Amino acid sequence: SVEPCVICQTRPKNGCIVHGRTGHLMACYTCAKKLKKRNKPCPVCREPIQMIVLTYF
Amino acid sequence: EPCVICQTRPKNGCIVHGRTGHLMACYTCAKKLKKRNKPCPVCREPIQMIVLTYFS
Ligand SMILES: [Zn+2]
Ligand SMILES: [Zn+2]
Ligand SMILES: [Zn+2]
Ligand SMILES: [Zn+2]
């Protein structure tokens, strides 16, 4: 999607939530860290945030 | 923004090296690069890991 981060609605989607061989790119990196830090699941699949990847194009 | 290699499939292959990832290629072209021991196209750094990427 060409939309911004689902949480802050301002920063770009650059926080790949990675769980196994798939990642879910919906949030910015800082909002993705905030979810993981507060022990929140992946917004898309509600599966635990195994790791977060600062994504660039 | 199609895959830079096959110019057809979407960019869904996150080349991951450390905590940063470079999203320029599709997953199957990204596998092909890693398989053949080719570096990351963007930074020419080793492909540690490839991630099939999907949006919300
Ligand atoms: Zn955000
Ligand atoms: Zn997920
Ligand atoms: Zn491709
Ligand atoms: Zn790279």
Author numbering:
A (entry chain AAA): 425 to 481
B (entry chain BBB): 427 to 482
Paper passage:
The importance of the ubiquitin ligase murine double mutant 2 (MDM2) as a key negative regulator of the tumour suppressor protein p53 has been studied extensively. The RING domain of MDM2 has been discussed as an alternative target to stabilize p53.19 The rationale for this approach lies in MDM2′s ability to still bind and inhibit p53 when MDM2-mediated ubiquitination is abolished, thereby preventing uncontrolled activation of p53.8 The RING domain gains its E3 ligase activity through dimerization with either itself or the RING domain of its catalytic inactive homologue MDMX to form a homodimer or heterodimer, respectively.
We wondered whether the sequence dissimilarity induced structural differences that could account for the different aggregation tendencies of the MDM2 variants and performed protein crystallization for MDM2f and MDM2z. Likewise, the asymmetric unit of the MDM2f crystal contains two molecules of MDM2f, which form a dimer. Similar to MDM2z, there was no electron density for residues located N-terminal to the RING domain (414–424, corresponding to 423–433 in MDM2h). The major difference is the absence of electron density for the 310-helix preceding the RING domain. A possible explanation for this observation could be the sequence difference for residues preceding the RING domain, which form a 310-helix in MDM2h but lack electron density in all MDM2f and MDM2z structures reported in this study. The helices are stabilized by a tight hydrophobic packing arrangement involving residues A434 and F490 of each protomer. Both serine and cysteine would likely cause a steric clash and their polar side chains would disrupt the hydrophobic packing, thereby precluding a similar helical arrangement.
